[PDB]
Design a protein around this motif. Sequence first.
Motif, mmCIF file in Angstrom:
data_model
loop_
_atom_site.group_PDB
_atom_site.id
_atom_site.type_symbol
_atom_site.label_atom_id
_atom_site.label_comp_id
_atom_site.label_asym_id
_atom_site.label_seq_id
_atom_site.Cartn_x
_atom_site.Cartn_y
_atom_site.Cartn_z
ATOM 1 N N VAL A 184 0.885 -1.143 0.011
ATOM 2 C CA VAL A 184 0.052 -0.062 -0.003
ATOM 3 C C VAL A 184 1.025 1.174 0.026
ATOM 4 N N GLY A 185 0.964 1.990 -1.154
ATOM 5 C CA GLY A 185 2.005 3.021 -1.419
ATOM 6 C C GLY A 185 1.323 4.327 -1.635
ATOM 7 N N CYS A 186 2.065 5.386 -0.932
ATOM 8 C CA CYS A 186 1.463 6.730 -1.109
ATOM 9 C C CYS A 186 2.453 7.534 -1.595
ATOM 10 N N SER A 187 1.709 8.698 -2.276
ATOM 11 C CA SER A 187 2.465 9.542 -3.270
ATOM 12 C C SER A 187 3.013 10.795 -2.625
ATOM 13 N N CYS A 188 2.725 10.703 -1.210
ATOM 14 C CA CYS A 188 3.258 12.120 -0.455
ATOM 15 C C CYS A 188 3.863 11.874 0.780
ATOM 16 N N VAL A 189 4.988 12.152 1.114
ATOM 17 C CA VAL A 189 5.448 11.891 2.814
ATOM 18 C C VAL A 189 6.076 13.166 3.002
ATOM 19 N N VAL A 190 5.383 13.555 4.147
ATOM 20 C CA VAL A 190 5.775 14.647 4.930
ATOM 21 C C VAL A 190 6.491 14.568 6.262
ATOM 22 N N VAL A 191 7.506 14.940 6.414
ATOM 23 C CA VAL A 191 8.245 14.774 7.923
ATOM 24 C C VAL A 191 7.612 16.158 8.937
ATOM 25 N N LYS A 192 7.678 16.173 10.150
ATOM 26 C CA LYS A 192 7.197 17.023 10.717
ATOM 27 C C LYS A 192 8.566 17.351 11.803
ATOM 28 N N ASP A 193 9.022 16.465 12.567
ATOM 29 C CA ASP A 193 10.075 16.436 13.544
ATOM 30 C C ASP A 193 11.240 15.563 13.191
ATOM 31 N N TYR A 194 12.440 15.892 13.353
ATOM 32 C CA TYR A 194 13.575 15.136 13.106
ATOM 33 C C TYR A 194 13.811 13.804 14.309
ATOM 34 N N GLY A 195 14.458 12.627 13.683
ATOM 35 C CA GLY A 195 15.250 11.975 14.554
ATOM 36 C C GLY A 195 16.301 12.520 15.261
ATOM 37 N N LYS A 196 16.645 11.798 16.489
ATOM 38 C CA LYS A 196 17.919 12.061 17.204
ATOM 39 C C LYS A 196 19.241 11.446 16.650
ATOM 40 N N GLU A 197 19.724 12.107 15.661
ATOM 41 C CA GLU A 197 20.811 11.285 14.907
ATOM 42 C C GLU A 197 21.653 12.241 13.991
ATOM 43 N N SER A 198 22.518 11.966 13.598
ATOM 44 C CA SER A 198 23.452 12.466 12.678
ATOM 45 C C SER A 198 24.053 11.858 11.133
ATOM 46 N N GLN A 199 23.505 10.649 11.185
ATOM 47 C CA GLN A 199 24.006 9.982 10.001
ATOM 48 C C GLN A 199 23.104 10.398 8.757
ATOM 49 N N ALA A 200 21.943 10.948 8.990
ATOM 50 C CA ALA A 200 21.008 11.194 7.850
ATOM 51 C C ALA A 200 21.215 12.806 7.872
ATOM 52 N N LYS A 201 21.374 13.654 9.241
ATOM 53 C CA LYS A 201 21.538 14.924 9.385
ATOM 54 C C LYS A 201 22.939 15.559 8.800
ATOM 55 N N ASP A 202 23.645 14.682 8.123
ATOM 56 C CA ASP A 202 24.649 15.531 7.518
ATOM 57 C C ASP A 202 24.295 15.474 5.957
ATOM 58 N N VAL A 203 24.012 14.215 5.327
ATOM 59 C CA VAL A 203 23.549 14.103 4.027
ATOM 60 C C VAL A 203 22.513 14.906 3.268
ATOM 61 N N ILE A 204 21.417 14.968 4.234
ATOM 62 C CA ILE A 204 20.318 15.821 3.936
ATOM 63 C C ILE A 204 20.524 17.314 4.011
ATOM 64 N N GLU A 205 21.619 17.691 4.653
ATOM 65 C CA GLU A 205 21.893 19.128 4.844
ATOM 66 C C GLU A 205 22.869 19.538 3.712
ATOM 67 N N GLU A 206 23.781 18.752 3.257
ATOM 68 C CA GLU A 206 24.627 18.869 2.033
ATOM 69 C C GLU A 206 23.668 18.629 0.916
ATOM 70 N N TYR A 207 22.759 17.916 0.964
ATOM 71 C CA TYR A 207 21.826 18.143 -0.311
ATOM 72 C C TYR A 207 20.942 19.299 -0.260
ATOM 73 N N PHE A 208 20.810 19.868 0.830
ATOM 74 C CA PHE A 208 20.104 21.199 1.070
ATOM 75 C C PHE A 208 20.963 22.318 0.366
ATOM 76 N N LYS A 209 22.069 22.436 0.987
ATOM 77 C CA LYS A 209 22.677 23.733 0.874
ATOM 78 C C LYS A 209 23.251 23.598 -0.626
ATOM 79 N N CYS A 210 23.321 22.620 -1.570
ATOM 80 C CA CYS A 210 23.947 22.785 -2.804
ATOM 81 C C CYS A 210 23.016 23.464 -3.859
ATOM 82 N N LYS A 211 21.634 23.430 -3.387
ATOM 83 C CA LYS A 211 20.788 23.751 -4.619
ATOM 84 C C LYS A 211 20.400 25.304 -4.490
ATOM 85 N N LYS A 212 20.897 25.913 -3.345
ATOM 86 C CA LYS A 212 20.674 27.596 -3.060
ATOM 87 C C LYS A 212 21.145 28.450 -4.152
#
Length: 123
Positions: A95-123
């Motif tokens: 059962v697959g949905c076409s829209c996923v929205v996050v509200k609050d982040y998990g308490k880690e840094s293994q994703a919180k580096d890669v999502i940030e460097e994917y964020f800052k490169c398109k500015k």
Amino acid sequence: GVMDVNTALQEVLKTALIHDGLARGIREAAKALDKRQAHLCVLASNCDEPMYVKLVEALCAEHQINLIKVDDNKKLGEWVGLCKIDREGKPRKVVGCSCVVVKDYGKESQAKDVIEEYFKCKK
RNA sequence: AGGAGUGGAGCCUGCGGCUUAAUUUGACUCAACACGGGAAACCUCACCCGGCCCGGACACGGACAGGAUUGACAGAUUGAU
């Protein structure tokens, strides 16, 4: 930077499921953006309605929300947890949905580096 | 041998019959009948007339996040926000 962007959704949707921060759905996912507290949205390019994408790309852009491009929308039902597991670890009920929205982040840094460097490169 | 009586009277409460939409019911010699601690306005409530709800665990298949039930103002409908 040791992990790819197309698999970057996996561990962050796992570490945010323990805080109930995954808006499975479309309407209530979009209404989470009107609470002005959501942080990211994912559009699946395998879509079914041309009206559907032109509203959500208008909503997320003007309120400063970036985008993660994954292709398939039945594929996104796995990491949100909308698919029932089988006995040995297979999604026996897809059962697959076409829209996923996050509200609050998990308490880690293994994703919180890669999502940030994917964020800052398109500015 | 006596005393108080009961059975006559009015009323109170049980039990039959009749009546009823229903007059819920068990108990019928001592060993059923102011007994069910049973003095029921509602609740008790079983009975009658009408209506709402699931409080249908769990296992399996479908619907399934172009959704499954849910909740809700007004109007009509209603005994009835």
